[PDB]
Design a protein around this ligand. Structure first.
Ligand SMILES: C[C@H](CCC(=O)O)[C@H]1CC[C@H]2[C@@H]3CC[C@@H]4C[C@H](O)CC[C@]4(C)[C@H]3C[C@H](O)[C@]12C
Ligand SMILES: CCCCCCCCCCCC[N+](C)(C)[O-]
Ligand SMILES: CCCCCCCCCCCC[N+](C)(C)[O-]
Length: 392
């Protein structure tokens, strides 16, 4: 029974779970100033919270798709949601910033269930028509989270304890659990079949031998790093570094993630008249200019954070315009199984984000805003360099 009238509870709950894991990062980052204060830990642990969450994402990423294909998408997906609930609640017991961070890593493992199993089940459960719309809703949730998250998170710790946020993530995921339990059908085709790890390994060695695919996958990591570095470090840059208020922290998010959204909106209006190569080249202009603006300004004066914010906004507009197209070309740069190709590009991005956020951290700690933005600029140049190869 492809799709249905009453079968929309399944994708809706999947979306709710997706949202909960996304704010599980985006609400937490501004809350990390309170966390670090509670544990009497240094501010260098603030970005690391995100680093750890992301690192957990790439842990089972290569695994879940083929495994869920064998044991069923239903038990694996439900397992992931429960694991998220449990680890969200468990972090309330952490006792130090090291154990807090460990639990961030453990929580982050829940991230890869979305794409590798839930989404695979969506594609198998639904007519392309309905599937396309569900994908859009999911993409829209991913767009709303980094805008809504820091605002709601900043508003939260002003009143309520950081522990409450984790109870909220768990509560939302619990709702999605019971919905998925009653709704989500079993779409796995390979149930009962044997799973060869050595053969899985060979599939990954093969995707990684494709140079054009690797360039696009790496490019996607590099180009999105400045944005994630901002998400990771904006609380310490703004509140600790510029000694600004929480209200200003929230306000600075508006042009940046508003621009991201606006770039996506322009993308939607232009898609029928452009194609992908031209849209990547088009987004390339604000991507490079915005990063150049943030870097130049903060090298001139370390404290010009409005110019930094402006440059990041311009860059974010380009990202909204360029990224989705590069995702598409990268996926089809390899003719191997889409599950494998997807997981591979997911892991390569997370590798870059994890290491890149930590490097960004040391950049800012040592050099301030100038270094933060200069590192972001090199990342833009890496993307650009890969694009001249990828597009030729
Ligand atoms: C890249 C993968 C999956 C996409 C893919 O496989 O192509 C995704 C899945 C989970 C996603 C993260 C969820 C938490 C964060 C939400 C933020 O609002 C945007 C940055 C983060 C850090 C996301 C970045 C990226 O979008 C991660 C790793
Ligand atoms: C005759 C043996 C057929 C086995 C086919 C199995 N598989 C992997 C295609 O689903
Ligand atoms: C019609 C030609 C292909 C027939 C051979 C199929 C055998 C099973 C392959 C399973 C898929 C996994 N792998 C590792 C090959 O990528």
């Amino acid at each position: 029974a492809r799709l249905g009238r009453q079968a929309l509870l399944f994708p809706l709950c999947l979306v709710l779970y997706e949202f909960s894991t996304y704010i599980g990062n985006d609400m937490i980052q501004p809350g990390m100033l309170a966390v670090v204060e509670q544990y009497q830990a240094g501010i260098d642990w603030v970005p690391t919270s995100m680093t750890a969450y992301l690192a957990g994402g790439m842990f089972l990423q290569w695994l879940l798709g083929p495994l869920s294909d064998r044991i069923g998408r239903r038990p694996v997906m439900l397992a992931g949601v429960v694991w998220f609930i449990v680890t969200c609640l468990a972090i309330l017991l952490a006792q130090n910033i090291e154990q807090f961070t460990l639990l961030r890593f453990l929580q982050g493992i829940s991230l890869c269930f979305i794409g590798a199993v839930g989404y695979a089940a969506i594609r198998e459960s639904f007519e392309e028509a309905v599937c396309i719309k569900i994908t859009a809703l999911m993409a829209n949730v991913a767009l709303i989270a980094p805008l809504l998250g820091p605002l709601v998170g900043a508003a939260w710790i002003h009143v309520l304890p950081w522990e409450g946020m984790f109870v909220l993530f768990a509560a939302l995921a619990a709702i999605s659990f019971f919905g998925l339990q009653r709704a989500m059908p079993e779409t796995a085709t390979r149930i009962g079949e044997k799973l060869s790890l050595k053969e899985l390994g060979r599939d990954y060695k093969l995707v990684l031998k494709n140079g054009r695919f690797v360039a696009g996958a790496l490019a996607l990591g590099f180009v999105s790093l400045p944005l994630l570095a901002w998400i990771a470090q904006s609380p310490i840059i703004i509140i600790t570094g510029e000694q600004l208020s929480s209200y200003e922290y929230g306000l600075l998010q508006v042009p940046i993630f508003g621009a991201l959204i606006a770039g996506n909106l322009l993308l939607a209006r232009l898609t029928s008249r452009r194609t992908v190569r031209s849209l990547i080249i088009m987004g390339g202009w604000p991507i490079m200019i915005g990063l150049l603006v943030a870097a130049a300004a903060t090298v001139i004066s370390s404290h010009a954070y409005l110019w930094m914010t402006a440059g990041l906004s311009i860059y974010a507009f380009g990202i909204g315009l360029a990224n989705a197209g590069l995702v598409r070309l990268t996926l089809f740069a390899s003719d191997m199984s889409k599950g494998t190709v997807s997981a591979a590009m997911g892991m390569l991005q997370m590798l870059i984000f994890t290491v890149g956020i930590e490097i960004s951290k040391h950049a800012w700690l040592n050099g301030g805003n100038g270094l933060f933005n200069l590192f972001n600029l090199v990342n833009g140049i890496l993307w650009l360099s890969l694009m001249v190869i990828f597009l030729k």
